[PDB]
């Protein structure tokens, strides 16, 4: 099923997600709904926090033909270099806005797979950017948090305006 | 200490490496010697089999400045995709030759780290190719084994001539 995606400045996006203790079929059902929601948006990644489920679960598919699904449960990352890359990021929870964000160029991801088994994976490029962006969501952080207060304020005001107009529909 | 690197068609390269039961002082010394040997060659990977030590130990460093050492003890891998990647592969035991070899582009690695602790790592790109190349060595397999019979024999003949001339130096 398609799930509702929370939008900035909804305070629920600031909730810190709780770790998953057992990866059962119920967790996999949520994962399937997250994937369906992500593919339909469309987006290349999605954190449970974004659909109002505060558990540390992330889904992703960096392919063009939407044929490479990846699951990260209880994800964490550690920079493997001090070098930083700049990427213009967008977010399904901050629809319509794209801004530059500087983040570690390479990181080591650690998480549980869709079966609950632990693994690690070195990430560079888009994968590195996405994993950091998704993990941030689980810690109640949004990419607009890295921007100047004036830019974030402009975005907030534009979105709050849109929300009021959408409410008048 | 820099160890000697065996070269095709030396029969000892066909030896199947035995598993490591404990990462003791001796094993720790070998790993250091292997890194020294690898960097001096220079190469981006090295299997114990290549320095005539038939234990399942692999070292790597895909960086350009010796800043990313990697250790794999008792490594094994499983393809995670059917998609094949073609890469121009070379080998310190088959110096001067680079031939295309098709291998799965994404694999899951299972091994023990430099401290003797088990871990599983998802690999793509160069890392995916190198781990398969290195594990093959531990099973007495060389990349030329994937080439046609005439191409492999041509390479063999070339090296035998070289070895012949080197001995007269
Ligand atoms: C930069 C990496 C961002 C991680 C994923 C986000 C989706 C998200 O909100 N995850 O929490 C995404 O797909 N964002 C899209 C996006 O910004 N993309 C998608 C591909 C490249 C990049 C271009 O800016 C937009 C169009 C919704
Ligand atoms: C492609 C992966 C190969 C695994 C590593 C080998 C070394 C080896 O013999 N390992 O067992 C290597 O460093 N090979 C080099 C090599 O083939 N390379 C190094 C970087 C890229 C690639 C192609 O040129 C050459 C130059 C000796
Ligand atoms: N073994 C894997 O597929 C690795 N991971 C995700 C990845 O592909 O990066 C686990 C998951 O998708 O459940
Ligand atoms: N977390 C890691 O460093 C993983 N591994 C190997 C790697 O770097 O891929 C351990 C080792 O190098 O002993
Ligand atoms: Zn987002
Ligand atoms: Zn080799």
Q: How many CA atoms lie within 13 A of A118 on its CB side?
A: 6
Helix (H) or strand (E) holding B11: none
Q: Say whether B125 sits in a helix, a strand or coil.
A: helix
**Which is nearest to B71 in space by CA: B121, B137, B9?**
B121
How many Cβ pairs closer than 8 A exist between chain A and B?
18
Q: Which of A80, A117, A119 sits opposite B121 (nearest CB)?
A: A119
Q: Is the dihedral of CA A125, A129, A132, A138 positive or negative?
A: negative
Report angle CA B158, B102, A69 to the nearest 5 degrees.
160
Unique residue bearing structure tokens 């398609």: A2
The two structure tokens encoding residue A84: 């930083």
Please state the three-class secondary structure of chain A as a single string: CCCCCCCCCCHHHHCCCECCCCCCHHHHHHHHHHHHHHHHCCCCEEEHHHHCCCECEEEEECCCCCCCEEEEEEEEEEECCCCEEEEEEEECCEEEEEEEEEEECEEEEEEECCCCCEEEEEEEHHHHHHHHHHHHHHCCCCHHHHCCHHHHHHHHHHHHHHHHHHHCC
Residues of A in contact with B123 (CB under 8 A): 121-122
**Which is nearest to A49 in space by CA: A25, A81, A19?**
A19
The alpha-carbon radius of gyration of chain A (Å, integer) is: 16
Residues in chain B: 169
> Phi and psi of A142, rounded to 5°?
-120, 155
The alpha carbon of A46 and the centre of ligand 1 are apart by a number of angstroms equal to 9
Catalytic (active site) residue B134: yes
Write down the domain spans for chain B. Answer: 1-169
Which residue(s) pair with B55 in the sheet?
A: B18
Whether B120 and A117 lie within 8 Å, measured CB to CB = yes
First CA to last CA distance, chain B: 24
**Which is nearest to A30 in space by CA: A8, A11, A49?**
A49
The alpha carbon of B45 and the centre of ligand 6 are apart by a number of angstroms equal to 7
Is ligand 1 within 6 A of the CB of residue A46?
Answer: yes
Answer for the pair B30, B54: CB distance below 8 angstroms, yes or no. Answer: no
The two structure tokens encoding residue B75: 């490594």
The DSSP-derived string for B145-156 is: GGS-HHHHHHHH
For the CA atoms of A71, A115, A73, B72, what is the dihedral angle to 10 degrees? -90
Q: How many CA atoms lie within 13 A of B73 on its CB side?
A: 17
Closest residue by Cα to atom 9, ligand 3, is A70
Residues of B in contact with A118 (CB under 8 A): 120
The alpha carbon of B108 and the centre of ligand 1 are apart by a number of angstroms equal to 26
The gap from C-alpha A101 to its chain's centroid, in whole angstroms, comes to: 14
Q: Which residue of A has its CA nearest to B120?
A: A119
The alpha-carbon radius of gyration of chain B (Å, integer) is: 16
Q: How many CA atoms lie within 13 A of A31 on its CB side?
A: 22
The two structure tokens encoding residue B4: 């000697």
Is ligand 4 within 6 A of the CB of residue B116?
Answer: no
First CA to last CA distance, chain A: 24
Q: Is the dihedral of CA A78, A9, A72, A69 positive or negative?
A: negative
Assigned CATH for B1-169:
3.90.45.10
Whether B122 and A117 lie within 8 Å, measured CB to CB = no
What is the rounded distance in angstroms from the CA atom of residue A22 to the CA atom of residue A122?
Answer: 25
């Amino acid at each position: 099923a398609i799930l509702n995606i929370l939008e900035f400045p909804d305070p629920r996006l600031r909730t810190i997600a709780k770790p998953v203790e057992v990866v059962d079929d119920a967790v996999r059902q949520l994962i399937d709904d997250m994937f369906e929601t992500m593919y339909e948006a469309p987006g290349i990644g999605l954190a449970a926090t974004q659909v109002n489920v505060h558990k540390r679960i992330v889904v992703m598919d960096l392919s063009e033909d939407k044929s490479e699904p990846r699951v990260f449960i209880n994800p964490e990352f550690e920079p493997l270099t001090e070098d930083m890359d700049q990427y213009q990021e967008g977010c399904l929870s901050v629809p319509g806005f794209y801004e530059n964000v500087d983040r570690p160029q390479k990181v080591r991801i650690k998480a549980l797979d869709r079966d609950g088994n632990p693994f690690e994976e070195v990430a560079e490029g888009l994968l590195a950017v996405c994993i950091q962006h998704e993990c941030d969501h689980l810690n109640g952080k949004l990419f607009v948090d890295y921007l100047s207060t004036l830019k974030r304020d402009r975005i907030r005001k534009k979105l709050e305006k849109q929300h009021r107009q959408q409410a008048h529909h």
